[PDB]
Design a protein around this ligand. Structure first.
Ligand code: A1ARR
Ligand code: A1ARR
Lengths: 306, 306
């Protein structure tokens, strides 16, 4: 019993974090085999940030301009290249702690664990979602650039996020590990803003199923709804449209609880229209939307990793 | 910017988790140097659970009755002893991954990270508090016994919790790593219940300071209050009394924000008396009480570990 925002165990990623220093800029890098990945704006200076041309900036650098530390060990750079917004520093030593890994670009609505790091040393781990507007509501301070987000499937670390920047509203923007930004953001110090966000409907429904699995059941009703009529109510409350694919995803949770997906939609409809009226669900007074259907099944069933 | 429930990086603890099997019972153990710690009810059978005498139960066991697996490696037990409610299995091999560590018994109100494990394999990490009633609101399924809770100070893992049992309300009870239960609970299948809980006042105040550090400031007011008059309002709303020691702890956060502790108490008073009125603090519609003053400073300042 119980339901928590649960991050994946972070050990496999901790063994990959390093410090990358170029000029007066220090940030985190990700050491996998003999390559260190890090945000390319590590080559920027304090006045290069407004409108940098990273191709000129990089063609003016030597390998010895990059100081990479893995713990108290000084890694030598033997090659460098830029891929989109990430820099790849080839080093003379392969990380012996390299886990089985993949680089994956996630869809909005998907969740991942963030290992927050400063100076190549991990600070904390927490769970996030890719918001529909391609920001993440992270917890990041100066020096956290290059911290990564990730998922784990048994033994394989799927890296999906590298941190680059904070936006004026306090939310965060970054890239996949191939350096492609999530959303329209660019690694320039120019006016950018998040875009209006929406609530991840399919995830709210998953969390309601989590609540039922765990014994909260006060929000259910006898009603049902059509997918169409549900989506007309969702638009009103700034919720993402629910697709048939979302319905299908929610199948296992529906089968385990005996609550048809569309019946749980009718319950969400009533929750949207009436509020929660001083009651809580899974210890929240808000409708929670950073658990995927997979997250719920994982935590309510006990899946491990190795 | 941003504020998350942040767990400590879990790698140092992951390298210590093992599987302990005795009879038909499998649970998790903690392998530090050449000793494996685990709940003593691993020696209980399905009918021994109602009122076991662990001293007879243990005096009937041999070392070879204990199957310890560290990954795909089979550790040999060469000695066993009981200390309070934990069993200590001495094994012929010292864990080469043993971190610097301590065993500490925490006070209620203190927080810690839980590495949830099944069959010696970590499943997830999350942050908890010791509730005033000495339960924890965890997320635990069958097989999670022996999962530990912990804090980290730079390089040292302070282990503070080992999981033993779930109580009828879905909350959890366990011991320190020397096997002393937190609270009045006993490792018997007899009627036990949590005891009425209270909100951890000093932590709510810390979290309000977190909100100010992060730019939420709508809940402040010009008022102040005496410690006495605050504590009369806290009793009413089932909050823990605030002591001068709590006030002193909140000093750094007070100094960094320029908001006197008692001024923030006046704000909490107004929040208790008027509710939040459809507004949120740090993305919560509830007054959050599982962040200590130390947690806030750590996350709002960027402390790492190594
Ligand atoms: C990261 O540690 C870092 N620090 C760097 C220094 C040099 C080069 C690259 C660096 O990367 C931090 C992490 C940030 C800091 C606070 N919280 C975080 O997550 N990243 C930055 O400081 C980042 C550096 C620039 C990224 C793009 C290319 C040039 C270098 N800056 C920002 O994140 C700023 N955001 C920003 O400029 O957004 C666009 C914008 C919007 C509106 C007006 C003007 C610009 C942040 C730090 O500035 C604030 C928005 C004021 C918070
Ligand atoms: C742990 O994995 C485990 N499993 C064991 C099997 C044998 C011996 C020791 C074991 O430890 C689980 C973890 C639990 C399971 C679900 N969520 C969890 O956190 N622990 C137990 O199953 C535990 C075993 C007993 C502990 C005390 C000594 C004998 C073995 N049992 C419980 O946690 C039960 N709680 C309980 O009995 O509380 C007292 C009580 C209150 C009211 C009426 C009767 C007894 C749980 C599993 O039972 C429920 C309360 C119904 C949930």
């Amino acid at each position: 019993s119980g339901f928590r925002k649960m991050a994946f165990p972070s050990g496999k990623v901790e063994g990959c974090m390093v410090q990358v220093t170029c000029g007066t800029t220090t940030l985190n890098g990700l050491w996998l085999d003999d390559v260190v990945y890090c945000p390319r704006h590590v080559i920027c200076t304090s006045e290069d940030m407004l409108n940098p041309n990273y191709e000129d900036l990089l063609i003016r650098k030597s390998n010895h301009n990059f100081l990479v530390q893995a713990g108290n060990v000084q890694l030598r750079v033997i090659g460098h290249s830029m891929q989109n917004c990430v820099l790849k520093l080839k080093v003379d030593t392969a990380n012996p702690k390299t886990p089985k890994y993949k680089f994956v670009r996630i869809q909005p609505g998907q969740t991942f664990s963030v290992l927050a790091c400063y100076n190549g040393s991990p600070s904390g781990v927490y769970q996030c979602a890719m918001r529909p507007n391609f920001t993440i509501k992270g917890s990041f301070l100066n020096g956290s650039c290059g911290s990564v987000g990730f998922n784990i499937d048994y033994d394989c670390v799927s890296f999906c996020y590298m941190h680059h920047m904070e936006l004026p509203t306090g939310v965060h923007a970054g890239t996949d590990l191939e350096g492609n930004f999530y959303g329209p953001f660019v690694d320039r110090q120019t006016a950018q803003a998040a875009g209006t966000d929406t609530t991840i409907t399919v995830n709210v429904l998953a969390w309601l199923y989590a609540a039922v699995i765990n014994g909260d059941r006060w929000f259910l009703n006898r009603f049902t709804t059509t997918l169409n009529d549900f989506n007309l109510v969702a638009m009103k409350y700034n919720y993402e449209p629910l697709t048939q694919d979302h319905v299908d995803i929610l199948g296992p949770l529906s089968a385990q609880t005996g609550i048809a997906v569309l019946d749980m939609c009718a319950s969400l409809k009533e929750l949207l229209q009436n509020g929660m009226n001083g009651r809580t669900i899974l210890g929240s007074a808000l409708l929670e939307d950073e658990f995927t259907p997979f997250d719920v099944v994982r935590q309510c069933s006990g899946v491990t990793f190795q």
